[PDB]
């Protein structure tokens, strides 16, 4: 899943959702210098920090 350099945000907002759908399950599936996070709602993908 994380491979890439930097740090997924710390996201403290979910949709109330059991199996929310995801954009993404590891950084390589995220373009350029983003990585794959559990997002607000299903992984999505992020500018790291």
Not at 24 to 30: G, V, Y
């Given at each position: 899943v994380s491979t890439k350099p930097g740090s997924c945000p710390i996201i403290l907002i979910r949709c109330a959702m059991l199996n929310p759908p995801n954009?993404?399950?590891?950084?390589?599936?995220?373009?350029?210098?983003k990585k794959c996070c559990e997002g607000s709602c299903g992984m999505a993908c992020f500018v790291p920090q």
């Open positions: 954009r993404c399950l590891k950084d390589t599936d995220c373009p350029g210098i």
